[PDB]
Paper text:
Nonhomologous end joining is a critical mechanism that repairs DNA double-strand breaks in human cells. Nonhomologous end joining (NHEJ) is dependent on several canonical proteins, namely, the heterodimer Ku70/80 (Ku), the large DNA-dependent protein kinase catalytic subunit (DNA-PKcs), DNA ligase IV (Lig4), x-ray repair cross-complementing protein 4 (XRCC4), and XRCC4-like factor (XLF). Following a DSB, the first NHEJ protein that binds the break site is Ku, where it rapidly recruits DNA-PKcs to form the DNA-PK complex or holoenzyme. PAXX (paralog of XRCC4 and XLF) is a more recently identified NHEJ accessory protein, which structurally resembles XRCC4 and XLF [reviewed in (11)].
Recently, using cryo–electron microscopy (cryo-EM), we revealed that DNA-PK can exist as a dimer mediated by the C terminus of Ku80 allowing bridging of broken DNA ends. However, to understand whether the binding of PAXX and XLF to DNA-PK is mutually exclusive, we prepared a cryo-EM sample of DNA-PK, Lig4, XRCC4, PAXX, and XLF. (E) Cryo-EM map of the Ku80-mediated DNA-PK LR synaptic dimer with PAXX (cyan) and XLF (pink). Furthermore, we observed density corresponding to the P-KBM of PAXX bound to Ku70 and density for the X-KBM of XLF bound to Ku80 in agreement with the previous study. The binding of both KBM’s results in an opening of both vWA domains of Ku70 and Ku80 of similar amplitude shows that both proteins can bind simultaneously within this dimer. However, it is not clear from our data whether binding of PAXX to Ku aids the binding of XLF (or vice versa); however, the binding of one may provide structural stability and aid the binding of the second factor, which requires further investigation. We demonstrate that PAXX and XLF can bind simultaneously to Ku and that PAXX bridges the Ku80-mediated dimer of DNA-PK but cannot structurally substitute for XLF in the XLF-mediated DNA-PK dimer. The simultaneous binding of PAXX and XLF to the same Ku70/80 heterodimer may allow rapid and safe transition from one LR synaptic complex to the other without risk of dismantling the assembly.
Residue numbers in the entry:
A (entry chain L): 6 to 170, 181 to 544
B (entry chain S): 123 to 253, 259 to 349, 356 to 365
C (entry chain T): 32 to 223, 229 to 538
D (entry chain S): 2308 to 2429
E (entry chain R): 654 to 760
F (entry chain M): 180 to 202
G (entry chain m): 293 to 299
Write the structure that this text describes.
Amino acid sequence: NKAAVVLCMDVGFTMSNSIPGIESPFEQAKKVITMFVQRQVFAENKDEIALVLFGTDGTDNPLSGGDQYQNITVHRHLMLPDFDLLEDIESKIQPGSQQADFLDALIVSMDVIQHETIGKKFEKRHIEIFTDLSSRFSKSQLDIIIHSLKKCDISLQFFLPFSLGGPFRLGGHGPSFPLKGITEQQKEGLEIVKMVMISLEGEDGLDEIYSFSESLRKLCVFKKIERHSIHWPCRLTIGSNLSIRIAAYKSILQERVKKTWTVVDAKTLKKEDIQKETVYCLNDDDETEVLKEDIIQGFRYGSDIVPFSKVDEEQMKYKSEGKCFSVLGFCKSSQVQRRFFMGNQVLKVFAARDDEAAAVALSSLIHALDDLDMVAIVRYAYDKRANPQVGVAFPHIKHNYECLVYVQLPFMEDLRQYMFSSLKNSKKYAPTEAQLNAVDALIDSMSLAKKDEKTDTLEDLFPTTKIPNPRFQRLFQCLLHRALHPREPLPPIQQHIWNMLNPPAEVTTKSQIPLSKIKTLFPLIEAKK
Amino acid sequence: CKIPALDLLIKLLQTFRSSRLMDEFKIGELFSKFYGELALKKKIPDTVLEKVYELLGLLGEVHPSEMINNAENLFRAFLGELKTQMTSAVREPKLPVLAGCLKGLSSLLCNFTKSMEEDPQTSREIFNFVLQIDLKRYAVPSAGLRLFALHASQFSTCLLDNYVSLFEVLLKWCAHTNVELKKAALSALESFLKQVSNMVAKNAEMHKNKLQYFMEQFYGIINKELSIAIRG
Amino acid sequence: YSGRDSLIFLVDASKAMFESQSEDELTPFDMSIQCIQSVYISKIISSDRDLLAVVFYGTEKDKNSVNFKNIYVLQELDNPGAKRILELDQFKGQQGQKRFQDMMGHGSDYSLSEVLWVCANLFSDVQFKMSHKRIMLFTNEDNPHGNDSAKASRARTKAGDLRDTGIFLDLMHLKKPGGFDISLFYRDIISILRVHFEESSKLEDLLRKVRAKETRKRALSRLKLKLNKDIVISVGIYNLVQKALKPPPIKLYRETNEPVKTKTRTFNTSTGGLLLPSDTKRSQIYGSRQIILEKEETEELKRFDDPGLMLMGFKPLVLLKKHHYLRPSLFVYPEESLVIGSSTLFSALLIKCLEKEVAALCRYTPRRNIPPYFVALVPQEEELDDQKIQVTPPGFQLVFLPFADDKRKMPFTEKIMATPEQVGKMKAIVEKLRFTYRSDSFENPVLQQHFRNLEALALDLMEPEQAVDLTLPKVEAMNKRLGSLVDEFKELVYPPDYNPEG
Amino acid sequence: SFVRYKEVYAAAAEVLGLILRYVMERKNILEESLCELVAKQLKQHQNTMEDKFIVCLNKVTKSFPPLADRFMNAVFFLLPKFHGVLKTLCLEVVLCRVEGMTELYFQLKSKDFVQVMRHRDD
Amino acid sequence: KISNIFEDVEFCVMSGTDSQPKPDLENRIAEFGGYIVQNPGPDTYCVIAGSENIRVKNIILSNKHDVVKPAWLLECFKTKSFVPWQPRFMIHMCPSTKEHFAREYDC
Amino acid sequence: CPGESLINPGFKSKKPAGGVDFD
Amino acid sequence: KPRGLFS
DNA sequence: AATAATAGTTTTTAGTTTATTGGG
DNA sequence: CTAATAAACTAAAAACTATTATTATG
């Protein structure tokens, strides 16, 4: 279903003035809208997007009247996002000398939503606000806005160039704004934003505020109009006397390309001009033509290849039942290693949804398996056209729900005997103690973990799994460029891609001296390519 | 398609060179056969097997319009792959065997086609300018020098530029081991001198290049250097 | 690469091979027949690339180049085809051995020096890099050549010289109502107690057809891990597990069995003539505009980093989620060819990351035309079995990390607890259903069925061998070890009238 | 034993075979232990591939025939493997053993003397 | 060849090992004009049945070909005349010989 | 060879598949 | 909980 | 008168074909 | 009021041994 998301973006000259050495809030906001809108148009999102702009010299809003709702220009109504949206983001977004109360723009864009949320189906109605919190304003409608939001079901977010609270990086790991360089106008705006969100959402109101930098390298940008992957409605079976329905889900699922490169002509730019055929012709006798069924299949057999059609195999091959998830037995959790984790997906499976008895049964599973340190062997079959597989099932407890994770297990044919040697047997390559201490000093200076103080948990200085694939970012960059600049070469790789790709270089500065220790203590020759 | 295929290709080659213009017109069918065979989307055969290009280069036939038109498609594909592989953008500024084979093809085909009546001339010129290293065998640069020597006139008005750069590249190529490089560079250089002499004879800007490039190098020259200046 | 395996098969042609203490048990000849058929099938499944031969002695009719009488060779060193299987199954069976006696000799004098000579010559005939020299005799008496002392001496001299040349002979215990004793003519002429009245020489496993397949010491890929930008480590990346499947359809002509050349061709719709690579443009029509592009920059977007590894840092293993698992884990072994001295470094870093339990997170690019992903490196130590043979290689188990867009969303689930009695109920259930794990006991029954079908049709059997579906529980013992636990847990959790479905 | 160039073991086998023809100038042999060492080296990493093996066997047996007895079958085994001058090397090696001539007719006919004697090389 | 009546009748020789080896059957059918193919072709009318295989079972599952025993073709050959189909060698026939059996008798 | 299948020495010795066996 | 341009 | 890239085998593998559900 | 989705299916590109012309010397 569609979503009626709108944008109430500050265009005032306050953010258009960049602080020397710090990226302008105007330009960071432009970066965020560009990245969101390219991820929206290229994915061809059906959710309707509109836009109003405050801090603008012009005023063409339906709520005019003077000193309120003024200096605010509504540009795009709720229709689909396109490349003309990119053009307007790049061209029409200009430093707006005029300033206005952002609350009036909020009410303008709410009226815009009400104008265009009708006549179209919608599973979500939304507004956000780009603001450096330094634009001229008067806090008058803020609580009126909170009430109007509660009465119109419209969600919000306020972005700042300022961080919420590592090398200084934009789109990477580290700071992206001075920690105390925010003006008192920005501080009072932050207090207003905080109170608005704690009145609207709740304790996650501080979990409601974010910034441009982490936007420029993460994909939460698409979390609440998001629709989860297709579930697996099936029934796990216990031997021959028990069976419970399931709603399986694939938590880890590597993202694929949505569109392949269609082979169009170079003379008319058409797939229609590109017609192809496969010619089965005997590899000898001047390529004697063979009918597409006169070619049949064989299989390799020892020192020969026996002709063996697929029909003879399928007419008796043991085929899977279909959507069936049959348990086989149980093994200890210590008997399974990550090397036996087969497949690319992670089946974050769940019991029968909306069946609280299934929830009780699943909780019993989680508790007893955790206490027994015990894993389950279940035969899995996606459907009848999918061959059966063996897999390991182990409990996975989240802070809000217990769950079971199913990962495919290997067969005997999967295993390969690849012999190696004993590294510790290498007395000629025994690690000298000084080298070991240099390695330890490096690792300590190279460690990417910080023990979170006043807690008991540990952090990672380079959390990567929470970051999307960097190739899609530059891929869409070049896609939009080539679309807009077919005559111009593809753009280079954005710096933020390196920043998100590179780890915190402060750890590297720590490791510098131990790096010298290692390179002095270890003889490492090189082979030329 | 293997060493037998390689030997077959060279045998047919030497057959065309030896026997020609007696029944070497029964090959247009075979020409189109090879044209479609290479035009196969599943083009497996190795770059060594690409001496077919010299085979595709044809001089034993009266050349009906058919292979004349097919030659344009040949040239576009060849310039495309030259651009692809010359640039290091494919992890290689390298062409293992394709470049010399294309040189031979164009040598046998440009004889009757593509003089300076069109822009794509200087387009195909751009590729040979980079000719860096050939690792002790030095086939491709000398091959390009020979190819230019054959169709130097096909490149006039786009060689009246960069007098020096072409001058020193000719000097270095003729001053390198594998003396075939030397003689190919000498032939390309003398063809270059022929063309520049004709054009400056027909340039009203004669005095310009005269006091600009010819007189200076001729005085500066004074092994074969002095002989080369004498020829110039 | 390492050499191949030479498996030499040689049976006696006499009455001892054709007789038993109980003829219901298949005679030594026929028993050797199912042994050779089974090992041929196993080799076809697993290692159908080496060379296998069949030769006879004792037969009064001989056929060999040396013209050694009573030494008749049947098949040269050959890969086992269906032809060999069928031509050995005709003599398979007690009726088949009578056919053998009729059309083939059985029972005559012979010298072991003769068979050693002919097998040495046959091994001399091969033209391949070689590693294994295995000769497998088939006889049920040790004496017959110890009877002739000169014959025994020359035979043992020849065998000793051959084993000096690496020719490795393995004794096969064979059933004999008189016995097949060792340390009488054996343990002094074989390179390596009971009178071996039985035939136990691992013949059980020789009859155990193996549905396995693995390559011969094949290198997957060797990479060079750059530390920061200049210090580089040569590493060998390998797997102890790799997906296997049925061989792909080998296309062949239905009228000649000849693989028909399958050449595809894109051609102009305007003309019908072939499309040149220039004629085709890459297009992805986003919105209303068709973005036209080409292959070189397409892969230059697919590729982003050089083949190698770019280290990110060190982190305790606790910083990874158990559900976080991108692609199946690999193993990393030190390599001392491109960078020498990295074995000392590998041992040092292995021990040090063992001490601090710090994983090596790394930006990894296997080759060109592939994005640099992020991988977790955990020290995978050497594990020695009972005989101190490394069952887990020393090195690093490399674990792969997904991305934010590479994780689908999970709808919120209720965490509704279960009473401790239910927990104990399933604890008893699982304790009844408890056993150990071993991956060699698990297979794909579909794949096994494929293998058996292909064999039996190539074997021209009236019926395919039936794959055992080990991916299905035994319901009898299941309900035996559940009993009242299932319905007790039901009434504890589920209403009796409300099944989990409907 | 070192093999980066043919010359190393070539000249080495030269001098060692000469030793074998001149240890006590053949008026005595008490350093037969040294000959055992060189024979073990012949086994040591030259009974696996055995290419330089035949070369050193050549050079030592030209000066000292009575050593190829330990490798008769070996040279019989590797003859079909070799096809170049290695064939002639093996042939002269077995030619040095007139003492080793007890019965080789069956060997050569089994080792297919026919092809090489038909194989016309001067 | 010598007898055109056995020509133009195509046999998918897949199993004939009862009393005479397969190559001899191939030679004799080549002499008498019956066409030979090793896998089911586009004009397959009859398939020889001499031994039980998985492929023979799959052919039995289909209804397109005649389960012919080699002794029947031997009788047709030594009598120098193709004989009409009658059930003493027959398991799975073709619809046309369903019509043939019907027009001569019942099953 | 210990730890190596006698059918294909150099390849790990194969034990028969057992499947599931409740205890 | 993100909302909007983070959705 | 010698050494040195170098194509010829396996190994995945990214797009491709089937359909099977999930809407609409 | 029509609609993703693995799966088996191809291609398809790259790594894995692996010999083998090639100057340098004459």
